[model samples]
Target: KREQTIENLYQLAQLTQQVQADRIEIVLEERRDEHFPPMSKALMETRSGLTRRKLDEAIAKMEEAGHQFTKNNANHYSISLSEAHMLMDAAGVPKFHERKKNNENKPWIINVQNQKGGTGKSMTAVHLAACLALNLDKRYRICLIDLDPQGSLRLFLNPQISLAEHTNIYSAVDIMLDNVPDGVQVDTEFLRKNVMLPTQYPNLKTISAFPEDAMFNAEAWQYLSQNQSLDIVRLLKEKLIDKIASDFDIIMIDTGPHVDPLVWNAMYASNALLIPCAAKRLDWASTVNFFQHLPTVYEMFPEDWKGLEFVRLMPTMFEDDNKKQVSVLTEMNYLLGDQVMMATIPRSRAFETCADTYSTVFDLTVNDFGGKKLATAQDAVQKSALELERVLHSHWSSLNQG
Candidate 1:
C-alpha cells in the first residue's frame, strides 16, 4: 500500500507539470493565429539583479556630484524620475529612453469594471495604480481616472493635494459633451490643466469624481442621443483620452457598478478590462449575469469599435479554506480558463483597517494597529501587494514580449 501511494504521488506531480505546459502551449497557438497581435514590440527589460548596494552606490555618486536628488519623509527617501535621469547623466551611466511623446504608441488604458456592486473595483484600481506608480521601474507614470460617481477612491487620497481642488471628471465630461464654445479648442494642455490632478505619490496622478459627476454623464448621454454630429460612445476615447494618451505610461479607470453611458464610455476607451468578482454565491450569480449581458451591450456599439485586447477576471476578498469559495473558483476557472488571474486578494482585517483609516494596504504598518497579532496583518497586506505586483508585471512582460 505504501509503495503504491508514493508512485501515485509521483504520477500526480508529473501530470500537473504536463497540464501546465499544455496550457501555455494552447495560449501560444492562439496568439500565433491572431491578426492584430495583442503584444507590444518593445523588449521586456529585466531588473532581477538590481541590489540595494548597487542602488546606494549610484545615489552616493549622484550626491557627490552636487545633485540634491533625494527627498526624505518619516518613512522613506524618494527620488523622482527626472532627478534619477539627471543623476544617471551626471554619473556617466546610460539611461533608458523616455516613452515616445506621440500617439503612435499610446499608454495602455485599463478599465476596472464590474456590474455588481461592492466588488472592490475602486480598491483594486487605486492599489494597482499605486503599485505601478510606486514600484514599477521609475520610468513609468500612472494616471487614475475615477469615473465612478460614488467617488469612493477620492477618500483614500491625501486631502491636501493641490490637484484635488482644480478639476474633476464632470468638467471633462461636460467639455467633451460639446458644452464649450465652438472656436475654443480643448487641447492636451487644456486637459492637463483642467482634468489631470497630481497625487501625493510622485509619478501618479488622478482625475477624481464627485457625486454630481453622474449628472454630467446623464446630460452628456441625453445630448448625444439628440444630436447627430458625434458618436456618444466613442467621445471619451476619440476626443478626450486620445488628446492626452501620450502623457502617461498607463491609465487606469475605476468605473461604477452600473450599466450607464459612463460605463460604456469607459469600456470603449479601454484597451483591457479587469473585472473583480467575489466568490460568494450572490456575487458569483451577479457576475454571471453581467457576462451574459455583455455581448448584447457590445452589439449596440458601432461596428468600428474595436473590442478590448484582453479581459482579466480577478477573485477578490477570497477565503482560501472555504469549500463554497473553492468550488465557485473552480467553476470560474472552468468558464474563464487562463483569463482568471492566478493571484487572489484574501479577506483580511488589515484591509478593513486600511479602509477605516482611508489608507492603502501598502501604507500600513504593524505599528499603526499596535499588536503582536497585527504583525500577521501587516505581512498579509505586504504579501497581497507583492502578489498583485507580480501579476501585473507578468501581464506587462507578456505584452512587451508579444
Candidate 2:
C-alpha cells in the first residue's frame, strides 16, 4: 500500500509539472477548504502528505547521484519541471509527449537591420540563421541575402568564398537595369545560377555580396528614381526573391547600417523585421530616429507595401549588472512593449572570440574547450542561443496560425 501510494503521488507530481510546462497556471483557491471529496481523502490519507522537506530530500538525493536540478520557491520547494522529467526518466518512468511540427509553406523572410554601425546587425542575422537551421527539430532550409555592399556577412559566414567566385547582388541589379526584348521572362533559375553560393552548413546558403554591388545598385536606384514612373524598386521581391522563395524555409537579409537603395529593397522584400540594438544611449537615440524616418521611406514605394507580418527589437550586448543599461532596457520595454523581444542577449567573450574564427556560438563544441572559463563561456552562449530559439519559435508558431 505504501509503495502504491508513493507511485500515485509521483504520477500526480508529473502531471502537475507537465501542466506548468505547458504554461497553464495552477492558481490555488483563496477560500477555506471544505470537507474533501472521497477520492481526494483516500489519496491524501494513504500517505502522511508530501512535505517540502521530503521533496527537497528527494531532489538532494538525485543531485548526489549526478542528476541536475534547479530549486525554485512557490510556497513549497520544487525542482524545475524539466529536471523533474529527467529524474523520472532516470528512475525508469516512461514519459510521453507529442512535439510540434514545423510549417512547410512559403518561406518567412526576415530583414535584420539597424541604422547605426557596431550594433551587431550582421552578427544577429548570421546567428539567427545558424540557430534556425541547427537547433530546430525540422531541418529548415535557410537562405541568407547579404544586401550590404560591404559583404561582411560573407566574410563571417564563409571566408573562403570570395566575391570573385560567385555572381552577386550586382548581377541581379544588372538584370533589372538591362533592356530586354518584350515577352522574354527571366526567372529564379537565372538568379540561382548567377548568385546563390553554398556554405559550410547544410540547409544554409547565401547570395554573396561584393563592394562593386553598392556602385551598381546606387546607379540602378538613381536611374529608377529619376524615372519615378518606373516603379522598379517594388519589383525586387517579385522579380528576384519570389522566384527563389520556395527553395528555402526562411530567408534572412543582412542590411547595411546606413539607408541605401539595397537596404530599401531588403525592407520591402521582407515579411518580418529584426532590429538589433545595443543598450547604449546613443544607439537607442539612433534607433528612435531610424523609426521616425521609416515612414518617409515607405511612402516612396510605388504601392502600399504590406508584407511585414511582425517587427521585433532585440536588445543585444546587454549587461545584467549595469544599472544604466537596465534603465535603458526598462524604458525601451515601456515604449515598445511586445515589440521588444523578451529575450535579451547578454554580452559575452565567447561571441567576440568566435568572430575571429568566423564561427558562431552554436558552432562551438563544449568538449573541445580546455579551460573552465571557456566552458562557462560556451554555456552562457548556449543559454543566449536557447533564448533566441524561443523567440524564433514563438514567431514561427504565430506565423503558422495566421
Candidate 3:
C-alpha cells in the first residue's frame, strides 16, 4: 500500500471506482465476444424445438450461410435461440420474449437468503440473475442488490475490485439509508446512473455494497425520537426496493449469513425467497434454525403484505457420489418435502473454477470449464430458473386477475 493523506481517501476511492469501471467494461466486452456456449442436445431436441420453435426464415438463411442442421431420429430439427441470434446478426432472427409491460404487473422481487456460511448465496444470486437477463429464452431486465455488508456479490463479479473507498459507488444500503459517506456531496432519491452499476452482462445491473454500507444497522436504531429518518423493518422495501422495483423485471437480493434487523428488512422487501443450503450436517441444522427464526420476524409484517409469494429451500453443494451427502439430501426431501425445490445444485468443481476467475458459469463455454461437465452446472441453473419462472408467472397471473 502507498502512503496517503486524509484528502487521499476520496481520491483513492475514485481511483478504485475507475479501476472497477474499466475492468467491468473490459469484462463485458469479453462477454460479448464469449456469447453463450452452444445449447445442450437435450435443450434443443425438446424445449427449444417445441416452445421457441419460431424462426423468421432464419433457418433457411442460416443454412445458406453454411450453417445447417438435420432432424434427429425424433423427427424434428434443432437450433438454440443463441445459435440463431448470433448467426442472425449475419442472417435473420426475432425477439422471442418481451420485457414485462407496465400497467400489467411489477417485477418479481426475489431474495436469495440464508443463515449458513459457505452456503453459496451470492453465487446463486449471480447466476440466476445472469440467466434471467442474458439468456434469450429469459431476457428480462434484472436488478441485483447486495444487502450483505461483506459485499460478496461485488467480489464474485470482480475479486480484484475493492469498495473500501466507495464514495462514488452508491450501495444498496445507501439507497435504504438515503445517505452517502461524508465529504461526498452527491445524493439522489432514485437509483441514478452511477448508483446502479452495469456489468458486462447487458441485461443485468447491480446496486453494489461495501462494508461501510452496514452503517444502516447502527444508524437507524440509535435515534431516540420517532423522528428517525429510517426504520430497519420497512427500510428496504418502502425506502428503496418499491421505488425502484418498477424499473426492473426481477430484483435479486443477496443477503449475508447473519439474521438481524437489517436482514429482517430484506425479508419484508421480497416477493419471493430462495434459501440455499449446502448438504452438510451442521449446515442443515443451521438452515433449520434459519427457518425457525423467519416465522417470528414474518409475523411482524404489515397486515396487507402476504409475506412471500414463493419460498423454496434449494439443496446446494450436493454430492451424489458421497454417501453421507446423499443421505442428507434424502433426509431433506423426507423432511422438508415440498418446501425443498425440484432442482438440486450438485457439488461441482466448475463453480469453484468460476469463483476463482471472478466470473460466472454463464459467462463461459462448456469447454471453458476446468471441471467435469460444465453442462451439469448449466443444467442445474437452467432447471432452477425454469421452476422459478413458472412460479413467477403463476403469481403475476393471480395478481392481474384480482
lDDT of each: 0.64, 0.62, 0.67
* TM-score-sorted candidate list, best first: 3, 1, 2
Best-fitting candidate, scored by lDDT: 3
Question: How far in Å is the alpha carbon of 335 misplaced in model 1?
Answer: 2.3
Question: The CA-based lDDT of model 1 is what?
Answer: 0.64
Better of 1 and 3 by lDDT: 3
Q: Candidate 2 residues 39-80, lDDT tens each?
A: 121221122233434444655678798666443343333333
Clashes of each: 0, 0, 1
| Candidate 1: residue pairs that collide | none
- Candidate 2 TM-score to native: 0.64
List TM-scores for all candidates, in order: 0.72, 0.64, 0.73
lDDT tens string, model 3, 1-402? 445675698787887875434434432343323333444445533432323343435455667776676554565664444563353344322222343343456567788888897888788778887666644533466788888888656555522232334335567777667665555443343364546665644456777777777777677557424554334668788777766765677788888988766787788778788998988888999998888987876776667575466678888888889888889888988997887887888778888888876677766665664444687787788788788777777777554443
RMSD of each: 19.7, 23.1, 7.4
Model 2 RMSD in Å is 23.1
Give candidate 1's error at residue 328 in angstroms.
1.5
Better of 2 and 3 by lDDT: 3
Distance from true location, Cα of 137 in model 2, Å: 2.3
lDDT ranking from best to worst?
Answer: 3, 1, 2
Q: What is the total number of backbone clashes in candidate 3?
A: 1
